[PDB]
Amino acid sequence: RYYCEYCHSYLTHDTLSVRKSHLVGKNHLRITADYYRNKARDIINKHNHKRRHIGKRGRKERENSSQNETLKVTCLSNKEKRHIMHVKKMNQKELAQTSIDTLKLLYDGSPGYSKVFVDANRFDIGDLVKASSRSRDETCESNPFPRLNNPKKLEPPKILSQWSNTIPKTSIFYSV
Amino acid sequence: VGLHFFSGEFWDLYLEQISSRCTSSKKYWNVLRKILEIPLHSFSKFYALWLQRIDDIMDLKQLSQLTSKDELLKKLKIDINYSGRKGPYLQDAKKKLKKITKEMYMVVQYQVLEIYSIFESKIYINYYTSPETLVS
Amino acid sequence: VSTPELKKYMDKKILLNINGSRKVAGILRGYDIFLNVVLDDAMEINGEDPANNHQLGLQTVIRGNSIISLEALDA
Amino acid sequence: MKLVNFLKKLRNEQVTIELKNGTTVWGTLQSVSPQMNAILTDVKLTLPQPRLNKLNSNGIAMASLYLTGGQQPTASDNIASLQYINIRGNTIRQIILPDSLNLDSLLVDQKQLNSLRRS
Amino acid sequence: ALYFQNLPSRPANKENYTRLLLKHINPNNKYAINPSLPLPHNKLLDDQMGLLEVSISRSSKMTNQAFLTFVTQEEADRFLEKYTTTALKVQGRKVRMGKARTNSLLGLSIEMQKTYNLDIKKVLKARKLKR
Amino acid sequence: KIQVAHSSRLANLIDYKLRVLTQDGRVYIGQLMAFDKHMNLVLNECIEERVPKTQLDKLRPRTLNIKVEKRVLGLTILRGEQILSTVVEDKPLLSKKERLVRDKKEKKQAQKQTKLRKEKEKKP
Amino acid sequence: GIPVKLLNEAQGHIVSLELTTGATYRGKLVESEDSMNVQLRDVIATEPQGAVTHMDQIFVRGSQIKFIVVPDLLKNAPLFKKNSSRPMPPIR
Amino acid sequence: LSRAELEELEEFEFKHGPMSLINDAMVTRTPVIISLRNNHKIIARVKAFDRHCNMVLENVKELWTEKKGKNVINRERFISKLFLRGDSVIVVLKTP
RNA sequence: UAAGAUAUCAGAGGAAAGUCCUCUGAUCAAACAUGCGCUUCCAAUAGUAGAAGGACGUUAAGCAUUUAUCAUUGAACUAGUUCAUUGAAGUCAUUGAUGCAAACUCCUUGGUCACACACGGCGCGGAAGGCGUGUUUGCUGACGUUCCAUUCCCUUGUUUCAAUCAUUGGUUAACUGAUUUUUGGGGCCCUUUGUUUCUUCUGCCUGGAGAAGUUUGACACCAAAUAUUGGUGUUAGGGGAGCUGGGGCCUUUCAAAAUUUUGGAAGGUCUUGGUAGGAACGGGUGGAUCUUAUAAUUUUUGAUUUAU
């Protein structure tokens, strides 16, 4: 007999094709997509709880650290730490999905932009994406002069929220 | 082409290839110390990565990979050989170390927001086109 | 046991390496469970492209104990 | 008949498996598999010296001898001692079994007698 | 004839422990190769430049300490003045060492060559130390 | 070094960092995870180690040091045809007692899933 | 056997090869059958004397494969669970 | 076929077939010469054989010769009892 | 891909030959216990160390070497060499590759345990084997069906001393030992890094706290499309009572043999393990192994000792 252990279910009618109908079935794909999403975070979320080995401290260092004053520690509340871990987890999700693609935005009206950045129609990748519009025929006859009320200004540089109040308050020149 | 104002996405390749490939994790701190001093368009994506490391530093030995044993004790006055009850001491070291990042984020941000607001905002065309193209 | 699925390959020009050094390009007709393969208009490739290259025969069948790789040089 | 079923009864004996390479393996034998996967214990795997005024020995086997991690640095001649070596069957050329054991007790296969006694 | 203090206790086998004791004393010595070890009988040298035999008990009284005998008394001191009270360290710990109050046990075999009553004496007192 | 169990077959020593030899004189050293009828095996974090042709004159009979050129390749599936022998290198990260503990908690947790699945399939 | 069942778990991910001739292919793995023979798509092929090329589609007799290197996140796919609890099968 | 049918077939091919040369050499206590694909030959007496052509031998005398730039030597190695894997052999003759 | 099988041997018994089945021996194996003066290993603090393994790290363009296409046509040329043109293929590299060696830096691992600073064992562990007895079992695991099953308490910085309080025992109200409550003093740890990392909720470094809960359940987390459904994981550690298994020892009772040995029953003492599932039975049940199809190109019945 045969079964798929992501779904945990046995196949009802065993043939080769019923397997392939289950192997590329919508239900089964959503399981195996979700199964590896759980094993991804679990290696990171279950952080290596290391084992400590405490040495018997010296007579010398015990006197040199006694004269040194005891520093204050900061412990947050349970309600506080449940929110701050909700934030810091959601922040690391953002740094995954940045993908800084300003450079594609800069060469928009150039003479080979269809052939290099559209990426349905390169050579290296182009045959593979057609399986799984802005065509390759585009030349520099259409849109001769870019600035004819068409172009958008460059989106300004991003900044950190936490340190949003380090910015100089006034601009040097008067913008419109 | 490292100081190119739009080089942001070049370094993101280079940092992808250190983490992925190399084992030690002393080059990844060494390179990222450079990107912090350059006025790139997207610099805040590189301070976010520095601040995600500093927080995840969990032992005092891991502050040696940032900067030398001496320059820690002189410029900030924190010691790695401090044997004691470390928890608050490393919680202090971070707060003292995170500060001089923030003063560097004050330095670069002035240089970026100058260059963006004066020059780079206005320049609408960064490519060649042809000998028949005319610029504004 | 199972037949190798080269169903998408057939009738395209195909280079393949016989044992070690010899390379044989032709148009793939048929195949079997052992990967013994038969192809039309064969030509033995070498270092000098027109010079040392010579044609083999109208139909030739290769034993699957000497196929290493079989690249499909067409769509 | 399978004569590999003879080897299974030869268990806890000193033996020399001698491989296709030319590498001899002197050791204490354990469970031989049906495909002749012999698995030894207190072993000493070596290469002989084909003398003939420095004829070069097996180049591949010298590499595989050092790689095992058993060759000690001050081994002057080419030997390597270790515990536990599992050996894939097809590589066995010979097996030099010891002088003491009697073949006549062991070469009587049980499934040979159990076919004739049953008929 | 010499007597050490605070040596590492833990390597429990004698042939293995004296390997470490020979290793820290003389790097690139005879025994950093590991085929075989010499064993002189009660009544040959281990390493060059003075060394002959080492001796270590497991008893609770002679715990971290270990006797050590040389070829002669001047060479035994010549080893102590090789370092000249600059404390060298085996595995991890700095050794403090002095001259042995009791004479070297195999040195007496060398001295009287230059001894059954001593062997009679050992049996008698150890029976009384048993009491 | 490490003393392996005197009667321990290839099924027993899962998680033991092995030292597998192929026919060409190249060795793959890693944690074993599966095996098979015809003895092809899945190592976890293996490293191929090769003695280069230049170093090989040094192993001919006369402390020797050999420059072994190695390359990392994590999680392989070897082939049987190629294996020549195996030898054991390290022992697993978890104890013998602790590998029984993790079995019984997982044997308990696996059974709990089925009964929670069967009663979620029965009524709905 | 798990060694082969793993290779089916790696469809549509980048893998490597090493054919017993001493080549090294590394491209996305499209098909595999039970005899460990594979079809790779969009590959980079390294000849035994170092020469590298690119070929769109390749088939290899499984008999000549020396090893396959798989993505490292399948190290904890459920082939490797020791104690598994399958439900009672449906009646045919 | 059945399991009993193959037992008849195996007894035939050992008795009335090509391997009858080995089987008639085991019974009659006649020494054989064997050539392995090693290119060295063993002069021995057979004590058992099998399907795969592997065989247990007794009073083995191997005779192996090697050459390196047209310089020959003939080495002789004696063994009491040996077990020979069957793929190695290419030709078995039966001595007169 | 299929079929078959689930240790072997020997004896007695049931339906002259063999098969089927059953209890009695031997041998073999697994699991579990449990022993051996069994074997090996388990890191400074009386100090700023060190052992094993790395670095796909640096010094470093180190030092020492050797390498950068072939064919066709003309000119000059010695009697090979350079220049220009035409064709063929062409991993990148020359800060390379190959050989030699050192120094430094940094990473992962552990009993950084207890007692002692004392002229060739028999401290309490943990890790890894070898060897020996005993019991169970004879491939192993879910699932169903009838049955046997059937507990608690304290603690989650730790240790030590002092103060008092309470309880129990010894002896002539007093003394002593054990245990518990409130305070104070001292020692060590707090990286527990989400400040105890069994959950949830409250909460903290001038403190180690408080509330609720514990498996047909609860909690955490991930995924969506417009609350729901589908997935992964957590539910712990320490001590004591009980209850029960195994081990050694002692005394008693009994049977055999010539005061002793061997076996069985009970009580006492030391030590060690378990403490919520277990038995029978049942299936067109799962997986392991074994034999044969299978020595005929895709693994194991030879094309890697470079050989004439």
Coordinates of N, CA and C in Angstrom, one line a residue, chain A:
Chain A
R1 N 0.9 -1.2 0.0 CA 0.0 0.0 0.0 C 0.9 1.3 0.0
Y2 N 0.2 2.4 -0.2 CA 0.9 3.7 -0.3 C 0.2 4.8 0.4
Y3 N 0.9 5.7 1.0 CA 0.3 6.9 1.7 C 1.3 8.1 1.8
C4 N 0.7 9.2 2.0 CA 1.4 10.5 2.0 C 1.4 11.0 3.4
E5 N 2.6 11.0 4.1 CA 2.7 11.3 5.5 C 2.8 12.8 5.9
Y6 N 2.6 13.7 4.9 CA 2.3 15.1 5.2 C 0.8 15.2 5.5
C7 N 0.0 14.6 4.7 CA -1.5 14.6 4.9 C -1.9 13.6 6.1
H8 N -1.1 12.6 6.3 CA -1.4 11.5 7.3 C -2.5 10.5 6.8
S9 N -2.8 10.5 5.6 CA -3.9 9.7 5.0 C -3.4 8.7 4.0
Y10 N -4.1 7.5 4.0 CA -3.8 6.5 3.0 C -4.6 6.8 1.7
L11 N -4.1 6.4 0.5 CA -4.8 6.6 -0.7 C -5.9 5.5 -0.9
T12 N -7.1 6.0 -1.3 CA -8.3 5.1 -1.4 C -8.2 4.0 -2.5
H13 N -7.9 4.5 -3.7 CA -7.7 3.6 -4.9 C -6.2 3.7 -5.3
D14 N -5.4 2.7 -5.0 CA -4.0 2.8 -5.4 C -3.8 2.5 -6.9
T15 N -3.5 3.5 -7.6 CA -2.8 3.4 -8.9 C -1.6 4.3 -8.9
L16 N -0.9 4.5 -10.1 CA 0.2 5.4 -10.2 C -0.4 6.8 -10.4
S17 N -1.5 6.9 -11.1 CA -2.0 8.2 -11.5 C -2.8 8.9 -10.3
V18 N -3.4 8.1 -9.5 CA -4.1 8.6 -8.3 C -3.1 9.2 -7.4
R19 N -1.9 8.6 -7.3 CA -0.8 9.1 -6.6 C -0.4 10.5 -7.1
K20 N -0.3 10.6 -8.5 CA 0.0 11.9 -9.1 C -1.1 12.9 -9.0
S21 N -2.3 12.4 -8.9 CA -3.4 13.4 -8.6 C -3.4 13.8 -7.2
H22 N -2.9 13.0 -6.3 CA -2.7 13.4 -4.9 C -1.4 14.3 -4.7
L23 N -0.4 13.9 -5.4 CA 0.9 14.5 -5.3 C 0.9 16.0 -5.8
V24 N 0.1 16.3 -6.8 CA -0.2 17.7 -7.3 C -1.6 18.0 -7.1
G25 N -2.2 17.7 -5.9 CA -3.5 18.0 -5.5 C -3.5 19.3 -4.6
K26 N -4.5 20.1 -4.7 CA -4.5 21.4 -4.0 C -4.5 21.3 -2.5
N27 N -5.2 20.3 -2.0 CA -5.1 20.1 -0.5 C -3.7 19.7 -0.1
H28 N -3.1 18.8 -0.8 CA -1.8 18.3 -0.4 C -0.7 19.3 -0.5
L29 N -0.8 20.2 -1.5 CA 0.2 21.2 -1.7 C 0.1 22.2 -0.5
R30 N -1.1 22.5 -0.1 CA -1.2 23.5 1.0 C -0.7 22.9 2.3
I31 N -0.7 21.5 2.4 CA -0.1 20.9 3.6 C 1.4 21.0 3.6
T32 N 2.0 20.6 2.5 CA 3.4 20.5 2.4 C 4.0 21.9 2.4
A33 N 3.3 22.9 1.8 CA 3.7 24.3 2.0 C 3.7 24.7 3.4
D34 N 2.7 24.3 4.1 CA 2.5 24.7 5.5 C 3.4 23.9 6.4
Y35 N 3.8 22.7 6.1 CA 4.6 21.8 6.9 C 6.1 22.4 7.0
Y36 N 6.6 22.9 5.9 CA 8.0 23.4 6.0 C 8.0 24.8 6.5
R37 N 6.9 25.5 6.5 CA 6.8 26.8 7.1 C 6.9 26.7 8.6
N38 N 6.5 25.6 9.2 CA 6.5 25.4 10.6 C 7.9 24.9 11.0
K39 N 8.6 24.1 10.2 CA 9.9 23.6 10.5 C 11.0 24.7 10.3
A40 N 10.6 25.7 9.5 CA 11.5 26.9 9.3 C 11.7 27.7 10.6
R41 N 10.6 28.2 11.1 CA 10.6 29.0 12.3 C 11.0 28.2 13.6
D42 N 10.8 26.9 13.6 CA 11.0 26.2 14.9 C 12.5 26.0 15.2
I43 N 13.4 25.9 14.1 CA 14.8 26.0 14.4 C 15.3 27.3 14.9
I44 N 14.7 28.4 14.5 CA 15.0 29.8 15.0 C 14.3 30.1 16.3
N45 N 13.1 29.7 16.5 CA 12.3 30.1 17.7 C 12.7 29.2 18.9
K46 N 13.0 27.9 18.7 CA 13.7 27.1 19.7 C 15.2 27.4 19.7
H47 N 15.6 28.5 20.3 CA 17.0 28.9 20.3 C 17.8 28.0 21.2
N48 N 19.1 27.8 20.9 CA 19.9 26.8 21.6 C 20.2 27.2 23.1
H49 N 19.4 26.6 23.9 CA 19.5 26.8 25.4 C 20.8 26.0 25.8
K50 N 21.9 26.8 25.9 CA 23.2 26.2 26.2 C 23.4 25.8 27.7
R51 N 24.2 24.8 27.9 CA 24.5 24.3 29.3 C 25.7 25.0 29.9
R52 N 25.5 25.5 31.1 CA 26.5 26.3 31.8 C 27.5 25.4 32.6
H53 N 28.7 25.9 32.7 CA 29.8 25.2 33.5 C 30.4 26.3 34.4
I54 N 30.0 26.2 35.7 CA 30.4 27.3 36.6 C 31.7 26.9 37.3
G55 N 32.7 27.7 37.2 CA 34.0 27.5 37.8 C 34.0 28.1 39.2
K56 N 34.7 27.5 40.2 CA 34.9 28.1 41.5 C 35.8 29.3 41.4
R57 N 35.2 30.5 41.6 CA 35.9 31.8 41.4 C 37.1 31.9 42.3
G58 N 38.0 32.7 41.9 CA 39.3 33.0 42.6 C 39.1 33.9 43.8
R59 N 40.1 33.8 44.8 CA 40.2 34.7 45.9 C 40.5 36.1 45.4
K60 N 41.3 36.2 44.3 CA 41.8 37.5 43.8 C 40.6 38.2 43.0
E61 N 40.0 37.6 42.1 CA 38.9 38.2 41.3 C 37.6 38.5 42.2
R62 N 37.4 37.7 43.3 CA 36.3 38.0 44.2 C 36.4 39.3 45.0
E63 N 37.7 39.7 45.2 CA 38.0 41.0 45.9 C 38.0 42.2 44.9
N64 N 38.4 42.0 43.7 CA 38.5 43.0 42.6 C 37.1 43.4 42.1
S65 N 36.2 42.4 42.1 CA 34.8 42.6 41.7 C 33.8 43.0 42.8
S66 N 34.3 42.9 44.1 CA 33.5 43.4 45.2 C 33.6 44.9 45.4
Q67 N 34.7 45.5 45.2 CA 34.9 46.9 45.2 C 34.2 47.6 44.0
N68 N 34.1 46.9 42.8 CA 33.3 47.4 41.7 C 31.8 47.3 42.0
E69 N 31.1 48.4 41.8 CA 29.7 48.5 42.2 C 28.7 47.6 41.4
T70 N 27.6 47.3 42.0 CA 26.6 46.4 41.3 C 25.7 47.2 40.4
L71 N 25.6 46.9 39.1 CA 24.8 47.6 38.2 C 23.4 47.2 38.3
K72 N 22.5 48.2 37.9 CA 21.1 47.9 37.9 C 20.7 47.1 36.6
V73 N 19.8 46.1 36.8 CA 19.2 45.4 35.7 C 17.8 45.9 35.4
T74 N 17.3 45.7 34.2 CA 15.9 46.0 33.8 C 15.1 44.8 33.4
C75 N 14.0 44.5 34.1 CA 13.1 43.5 33.8 C 11.8 44.1 33.5
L76 N 11.2 43.8 32.3 CA 9.9 44.2 31.9 C 8.8 43.3 32.5
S77 N 7.6 43.8 32.5 CA 6.4 43.0 33.0 C 6.1 41.9 32.0
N78 N 5.2 41.0 32.3 CA 4.7 39.9 31.5 C 3.9 40.5 30.3
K79 N 3.0 41.4 30.6 CA 2.3 42.1 29.6 C 3.2 42.9 28.6
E80 N 4.2 43.5 29.2 CA 5.1 44.3 28.3 C 5.9 43.4 27.4
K81 N 6.4 42.2 27.9 CA 7.3 41.4 27.1 C 6.5 40.6 26.1
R82 N 5.2 40.4 26.3 CA 4.4 39.7 25.3 C 4.2 40.6 24.1
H83 N 4.2 41.9 24.3 CA 4.0 42.9 23.2 C 5.4 43.1 22.4
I84 N 6.5 43.2 23.2 CA 7.8 43.5 22.6 C 8.3 42.3 21.8
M85 N 7.9 41.1 22.1 CA 8.2 40.0 21.3 C 7.3 39.8 20.1
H86 N 6.1 40.4 20.2 CA 5.2 40.5 19.0 C 5.7 41.5 18.0
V87 N 6.4 42.5 18.5 CA 7.0 43.6 17.6 C 8.2 43.0 17.0
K88 N 9.2 42.5 17.7 CA 10.5 42.2 17.2 C 10.4 41.0 16.3
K89 N 9.4 40.1 16.5 CA 9.2 39.0 15.5 C 8.6 39.6 14.2
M90 N 7.8 40.6 14.3 CA 7.2 41.2 13.1 C 8.1 42.1 12.4
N91 N 9.2 42.5 13.1 CA 10.2 43.3 12.4 C 11.1 42.4 11.6
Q92 N 11.5 41.3 12.1 CA 12.4 40.4 11.3 C 11.7 39.8 10.1
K93 N 10.4 39.8 10.1 CA 9.6 39.4 8.9 C 9.7 40.5 7.9
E94 N 9.9 41.7 8.3 CA 10.0 42.8 7.3 C 11.3 42.8 6.6
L95 N 12.4 42.5 7.3 CA 13.7 42.5 6.7 C 13.9 41.3 5.8
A96 N 13.0 40.3 5.9 CA 13.0 39.3 4.8 C 12.4 39.8 3.5
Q97 N 11.3 40.6 3.6 CA 10.6 41.1 2.4 C 10.9 42.5 2.0
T98 N 12.1 43.0 2.2 CA 12.6 44.3 1.8 C 12.8 44.2 0.2
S99 N 13.9 43.5 -0.2 CA 14.3 43.4 -1.6 C 14.5 44.8 -2.2
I100 N 15.5 45.5 -1.9 CA 15.7 46.9 -2.3 C 16.0 47.0 -3.9
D101 N 14.9 47.2 -4.6 CA 14.9 47.2 -6.1 C 14.7 48.7 -6.6
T102 N 15.5 49.6 -6.1 CA 15.5 51.0 -6.7 C 16.1 51.0 -8.1
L103 N 17.0 50.0 -8.3 CA 17.9 50.0 -9.5 C 17.0 49.7 -10.8
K104 N 16.0 48.8 -10.6 CA 15.0 48.6 -11.6 C 14.2 49.8 -11.9
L105 N 13.9 50.6 -10.8 CA 13.1 51.8 -11.0 C 13.9 52.9 -11.8
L106 N 15.2 52.9 -11.7 CA 16.0 53.9 -12.3 C 16.1 53.7 -13.8
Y107 N 16.3 52.5 -14.3 CA 16.5 52.3 -15.7 C 15.2 52.0 -16.5
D108 N 14.1 52.7 -16.2 CA 12.8 52.4 -16.7 C 12.6 52.6 -18.2
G109 N 13.0 53.8 -18.7 CA 12.9 54.1 -20.1 C 14.1 53.9 -20.9
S110 N 15.1 53.1 -20.4 CA 16.4 52.9 -21.1 C 16.1 52.0 -22.4
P111 N 17.2 51.9 -23.3 CA 17.0 51.1 -24.5 C 17.1 49.6 -24.5
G112 N 17.4 48.9 -23.4 CA 17.3 47.5 -23.3 C 16.5 47.0 -22.1
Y113 N 15.7 47.8 -21.5 CA 15.0 47.5 -20.3 C 14.0 46.3 -20.4
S114 N 13.4 46.2 -21.6 CA 12.6 45.1 -21.9 C 13.3 43.7 -21.9
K115 N 14.6 43.8 -22.3 CA 15.4 42.6 -22.5 C 16.2 42.1 -21.3
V116 N 16.2 42.9 -20.2 CA 17.0 42.6 -19.0 C 16.2 42.5 -17.7
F117 N 15.3 43.5 -17.5 CA 14.6 43.6 -16.2 C 13.2 43.0 -16.2
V118 N 12.5 42.8 -17.4 CA 11.2 42.3 -17.5 C 11.2 40.8 -17.0
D119 N 12.2 40.1 -17.4 CA 12.5 38.8 -16.8 C 11.6 37.6 -17.1
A120 N 10.5 37.9 -17.8 CA 9.7 36.9 -18.5 C 10.5 36.6 -19.8
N121 N 11.3 37.5 -20.3 CA 11.8 37.5 -21.7 C 13.3 37.8 -21.7
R122 N 14.1 37.3 -20.8 CA 15.5 37.3 -20.8 C 15.9 36.1 -21.7
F123 N 17.2 35.8 -21.7 CA 17.6 34.5 -22.3 C 17.8 33.4 -21.2
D124 N 18.6 33.8 -20.1 CA 19.0 32.9 -19.0 C 17.8 32.2 -18.3
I125 N 16.8 33.1 -17.9 CA 15.6 32.7 -17.2 C 14.4 32.6 -18.1
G126 N 14.4 33.3 -19.2 CA 13.2 33.6 -20.0 C 12.4 32.4 -20.5
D127 N 13.0 31.3 -20.8 CA 12.3 30.1 -21.2 C 11.6 29.4 -20.1
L128 N 12.1 29.6 -18.9 CA 11.5 28.9 -17.7 C 10.3 29.6 -17.1
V129 N 10.2 30.9 -17.2 CA 9.1 31.7 -16.7 C 7.8 31.7 -17.6
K130 N 8.0 31.4 -18.9 CA 6.9 31.3 -19.8 C 6.0 30.1 -19.5
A131 N 6.6 29.0 -18.9 CA 5.9 27.9 -18.4 C 5.1 28.2 -17.1
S132 N 5.9 28.8 -16.1 CA 5.3 29.2 -14.8 C 6.0 30.4 -14.3
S133 N 1.7 43.6 -20.5 CA 2.6 42.6 -20.7 C 4.1 43.0 -20.8
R134 N 4.3 44.1 -21.6 CA 5.6 44.7 -21.8 C 6.6 43.7 -22.5
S135 N 6.4 43.6 -23.8 CA 7.1 42.6 -24.6 C 8.6 43.0 -25.0
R136 N 9.3 42.1 -25.5 CA 10.7 42.3 -26.0 C 10.8 43.2 -27.3
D137 N 9.7 43.3 -28.0 CA 9.7 44.1 -29.3 C 10.0 45.7 -29.1
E138 N 9.8 46.2 -27.9 CA 9.9 47.6 -27.6 C 11.3 48.2 -28.0
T139 N 11.2 49.3 -28.7 CA 12.4 50.1 -29.1 C 12.3 51.5 -28.6
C140 N 13.3 52.4 -28.9 CA 13.3 53.8 -28.4 C 12.7 54.7 -29.5
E141 N 11.5 54.3 -30.1 CA 10.7 55.2 -30.9 C 9.5 55.7 -30.1
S142 N 8.9 54.8 -29.3 CA 7.8 55.2 -28.4 C 8.4 55.8 -27.2
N143 N 7.7 56.9 -26.7 CA 8.2 57.8 -25.6 C 9.6 58.3 -26.0
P144 N 9.7 59.3 -26.9 CA 11.0 59.8 -27.3 C 11.7 60.7 -26.2
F145 N 10.9 61.6 -25.6 CA 11.3 62.5 -24.5 C 10.6 62.1 -23.2
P146 N 11.4 61.4 -22.3 CA 10.7 60.9 -21.1 C 9.9 62.0 -20.3
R147 N 10.6 63.1 -20.0 CA 9.9 64.2 -19.4 C 8.9 64.9 -20.3
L148 N 7.7 64.4 -20.3 CA 6.5 65.0 -21.0 C 5.3 64.7 -20.1
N149 N 5.4 65.2 -18.8 CA 4.4 65.0 -17.8 C 4.2 63.5 -17.4
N150 N 5.1 62.6 -17.9 CA 5.0 61.2 -17.6 C 5.8 60.8 -16.3
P151 N 7.0 61.2 -16.1 CA 7.8 60.6 -15.0 C 7.4 61.0 -13.6
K152 N 7.6 60.1 -12.7 CA 7.4 60.3 -11.3 C 8.7 60.6 -10.6
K153 N 8.7 61.6 -9.7 CA 9.9 61.9 -8.9 C 10.4 60.6 -8.1
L154 N 11.7 60.6 -7.8 CA 12.3 59.5 -7.1 C 11.8 59.5 -5.6
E155 N 11.3 58.3 -5.2 CA 10.7 58.2 -3.8 C 11.8 58.4 -2.8
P156 N 11.6 59.3 -1.8 CA 12.7 59.7 -0.9 C 13.2 58.5 -0.1
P157 N 14.5 58.7 0.5 CA 15.1 57.7 1.2 C 14.4 57.4 2.5
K158 N 14.2 56.1 2.8 CA 13.5 55.7 4.0 C 14.3 56.0 5.3
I159 N 13.7 55.9 6.4 CA 14.3 56.3 7.7 C 13.8 55.4 8.8
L160 N 14.5 55.3 9.9 CA 14.1 54.5 11.1 C 13.1 55.2 11.9
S161 N 12.0 54.5 12.3 CA 11.0 55.0 13.2 C 11.6 55.4 14.5
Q162 N 12.2 54.5 15.2 CA 12.8 54.6 16.5 C 13.6 55.9 16.6
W163 N 14.4 56.2 15.6 CA 15.3 57.4 15.6 C 14.8 58.4 14.6
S164 N 13.5 58.6 14.5 CA 12.9 59.5 13.6 C 13.0 61.0 14.0
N165 N 13.4 61.2 15.3 CA 13.6 62.5 15.9 C 15.1 62.9 16.0
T166 N 16.0 62.3 15.2 CA 17.4 62.7 15.0 C 17.5 63.6 13.8
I167 N 16.5 63.6 12.9 CA 16.5 64.4 11.7 C 16.6 65.9 11.9
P168 N 17.4 66.7 11.1 CA 17.3 68.1 11.2 C 15.9 68.7 10.9
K169 N 15.4 69.6 11.7 CA 14.0 69.9 11.7 C 13.6 70.7 10.5
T170 N 14.4 71.7 10.0 CA 14.2 72.5 8.9 C 15.0 72.2 7.7
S171 N 14.5 72.3 6.5 CA 15.2 72.1 5.2 C 16.1 73.4 5.0
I172 N 17.1 73.2 4.1 CA 18.0 74.4 3.8 C 17.4 75.3 2.8
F173 N 16.8 74.8 1.8 CA 16.0 75.6 0.8 C 14.5 75.4 0.9
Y174 N 13.7 76.4 0.4 CA 12.3 76.3 0.4 C 11.7 75.5 -0.8
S175 N 11.3 74.3 -0.5 CA 10.6 73.5 -1.5 C 9.2 74.0 -1.8
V176 N 8.6 73.6 -2.9 CA 7.3 73.9 -3.3 C 6.3 73.0 -2.6

